[model samples]
Target: MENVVIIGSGPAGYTAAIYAARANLKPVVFEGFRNGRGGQLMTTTEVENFPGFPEGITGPDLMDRMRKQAERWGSELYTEDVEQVDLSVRPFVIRSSDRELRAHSVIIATGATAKRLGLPSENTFWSRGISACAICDGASPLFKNAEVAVVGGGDSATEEAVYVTKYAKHVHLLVRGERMRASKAMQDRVLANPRITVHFNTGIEDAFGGEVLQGLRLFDTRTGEKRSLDVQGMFYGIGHTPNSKLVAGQVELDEAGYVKVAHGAATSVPGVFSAGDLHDTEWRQAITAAGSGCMAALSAERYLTANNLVREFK
Candidate 1:
């Protein structure tokens, strides 16, 4: 039996392990394989926003340090993939292949996955000039004073386009429909911005560039016309799918499939807690995720102590 079982190994999971380990909980972390481990930060390049690194650290290096810190404090890690979980009973059961483990408390740190357009050139230009987060990579030197394109017509797209204007010279808001799906206030904000140019019934046919993105070929949805636009960066304002499938029917989730956490990372279930992008759709940054992880660890520690579940260490 474990005090706490943390799922996922990104900043949130590692940070939770660090805290839980120091508290002598000796949490077991199921570092998922496939698409869940390390979260989206593994695909990222430079991480300038995370504090304590003046020169800005690479994403992999940052995650490596977090993982080592957790291990140094006695956090047990397993690279096995978790197949299912049962949270209805006291000692929550987690399954990986044929193996079964029980924990007094469970922290779901599995983050969300951003939606992407499967353009043929998407694989070639991802992280080089294409990104899902404008707030994270907008200030990068790659897009300094350069034109960037944002795809989508919802509030997310409008917000990203407005945010990118701080670093990008001009932003093209490409909508595949005649009217925008954004609210009146957001639409007004996007239209009021001089740096933004709205393109109705426009969709990206293909991306063109060498190693990095240089331009995009756009096609009109209403007409069969095609055109090319010179741009250095492309931002996908599309939404994300939370990694809540593991606890789909087991835990209460919001309408968008995000884990519904009560006060302070506490889920509807007694011993089940959620942290990071799994519960948060807005302000999905590494710092915020790490902060939420800390909250989850503290909550789990309190829960274990109140229930006398902490195992005595030798």
Candidate 2:
């Protein structure tokens, strides 16, 4: 028996284990087997704003470092996905395909995934200069003084483009059709912003770069005119599909089906906590996720200690 059990292996989960282990909780983290792409950073290239890396570090490398740091502090690691969890008992029982584990406190750090463009270049520059999140990576120093092209015309897209203006010298909002799908407020916001240029009936025709992103080739649907935009960053704020279906109706959820975390990372259910993009919508950065992970683990530790479950685990 362990005092805390952490689900997922992303920034949130690993950070939670790091914090919990330092407190002598002996946290157990299920990093998942082949499904180890739990961290949003796993799909990215280099992370330049995580604070500790002066030269910047690769996304996968950051996750690996975090996992190692957590283990160094006494957090046990597992390579399985929990298919089912029963949080109704004092020592909650969580069943995975490989084994069954019990813990007094549970921290859920399942992350979120952004809808991606299946293009090979998009995959090549996934975290390089192309990103699926505006708020998370838009304001990065890599985007400073650069032109950024945004894909999509919906409210999320327009809103993200508008936000990108803070760092980008100019933002080109790409619309696939003749009309934009964003709401009136979003449209007004994008149009009103002086830094944003709306390209109606336009979309990206090609993306070219070698080791990193250099520019995007835009195609106008109405005029058949192809233009190039030299930009340092590309932001995607189209929409996100939260992977919370496994526990959808079983726990409290947001309007978008994301798990609803109570104060800190505790969920509606006792002994259960939610963290990472699984519950966060506004700030989804790796550092922010790690902070939330710390909160969740601490909250779980306190819950178990107060309930006398800590002694039982020992």
Candidate 3:
């Protein structure tokens, strides 16, 4: 049994563990099974927007620092993936592939996954040239003074296309459909931007590059004709899938399956709190996630004290 159980080891979970441990909660963190560990930052190259490191830090390196801090504060880090959870009882039950744990309070910080097209080259050049968050990576040196492509025809794609222009010499907006799904106001902005070129009913076939990314193979959905577009970077504005399966029915989720928080960090369940992209769809930045994790830890600490769940630990 544990006083606090954090079900992720990303910025949010690690940060929460830091706070909860300092509060004498002695949190146990589930870092995840192999691939899921360290969250999205595992594949990310450079994290520029996260404060502290003015020179910037690699995504994995930043997570490593957070993980070590949590341990220093007395958090038991478990390198395992949570298989199931039972929140119906007073002391919640959490199970992984090997063992089961009972916790007085639980913090759900399983960050969302960036949706991707099942393209073969996507795996080959994931961090090399392809990125999911334009706002996060558009300013990278690889994309500066070059051409970049933004996929999708919705609000996210529209926003990314506009944002990339600040770094890229030109932006290509790839739309699979005949028209954009973004609102009229956003569509007007895309149309008016001379730097953005809208390619209706066009899609990327394959990505090609040497050690780094150099260009992509384009295709016309209607004509079945294939061509090549030489661009240094590509951004996917498709959307994200929240990893909320553990608490799907236990707590209330928004339309897009994001955990619904009432008071910034409080979930529908009193003892269950959510942090980071699991509950946040917008402003999904590293700093914001870390901030929310801090809030969840504080909130969970108060809930444990109010409910008399805080007990002496070994």
Candidate 4:
């Protein structure tokens, strides 16, 4: 049995392993096979903003560096996705395709996936001009002094609009409902913001701009008014689907279905922690995710040392 087991390979998982392994925890990481790619930074091109990458490294390059760093400390890693986890019992059992493993501590950093609009143009513009994270891509040169569009109607949408207001010259918030879906405060903030323009009863009709999003065609639900908004960026703040289905009932979850954690990393279960977008409803940036990963690992190490769940301790 290992001292700790981590079920993700992204920044959070790898960072946690690096910390726990250095603590002599002998942490094991399951980065997942085809489903879960460790270090997803390769999916993008240059990552200029990530700390320590003054020269701006590619996403893939960043992932490789983290992988090497974790392995350097003797942290065990696997390229298999865990299909099931039995955290209900002590010595939590984790089951992948080929084998079953056990660990005293479990770190859940599986990460949350971005929800998509599922349109052809939407697919085409992904990462080029379309983005799921406002914080990650908003400050990019793409949005500077340019027009941008944001989709969704909740508090996240309102907040994303506010964030983009700093960089984007004009932010067109396209909402599907007749009015804002957010509460009075959120609705007031978005509507009152000078840079944001609310377009109600509107939905995405199509996208333009080739591989890089140039603009979008929007439709009005009330009058069937179809109009075009020329913009360089499209942000989706609607919602994210956290990968918490496997451990749903077995673990505590927030109202939005994400795993509930203390300080965005501590779950109610002892020796169990969660990090990254899995538990965070706010500030879902890579750096924030990495920070949470470090916290989870540090917390796990302390939990492991503080409580000897094994009979050997007696």
- Residue 99 CA error for candidate 1 (Å)? 3.8
What C-alpha lDDT values do all the predictions have?
A: 0.89, 0.81, 0.89, 0.84
Question: Can you tell me which runs of candidate 2 are displaced by over 4 Å?
Answer: 117-151, 154-237, 312-314
User: What is the TM-score (0 to 1) of candidate 1?
Assistant: 0.77
Residue pairs that clash (backbone atoms under 3 angstroms), model 1: none
Residue-level lDDT tens digits of model 4 in 248-287: 8988998888888766577878888998888877776778
Tens digits of per-residue lDDT for model 3 on 3-117?
8899998889999999999998889999897437888887677888888899999999999999889999999999998999999997899998888999988999999864678
For the record, the alpha-carbon RMSD of candidate 3 to the native fold, in angstroms, is 3.9
- For residues 46-161, could you state the per-residue lDDT of candidate 2 as single tens digits? 89999989999988899889988999999988888878877767678878888888877788887775467666588778778988778778878788988888988877898788
Estimated TM-score for each candidate = 0.77, 0.67, 0.79, 0.70
In candidate 4, the residue pairs with backbone N, CA or C atoms under 3 Å apart (3 or more residues apart, or in different chains) clash, namely 32-80, 41-59, 42-59, 42-60, 262-266
Best by lDDT: 1
For model 2, state the Cα shift of residue 4 in Å. Answer: 2.0
lDDT, residue 189, candidate 4: 85
lDDT of 1 by residue, 160-262 (tens): 9999999999999999999889999999999999999999999898899998999999989988799999999999987677889999999999999999988
Q: Once superposed on the true structure, which residue ranges of model 3 sit more than 4 Å away at CA?
A: 127-129, 133-148, 154-156, 162-172, 176-186, 193-233
How do all the candidates rank in terms of TM-score, highest first? 3, 1, 4, 2
* TM-score of model 3 (CA atoms): 0.79
CA RMSD for every model? 4.2, 6.4, 3.9, 5.2
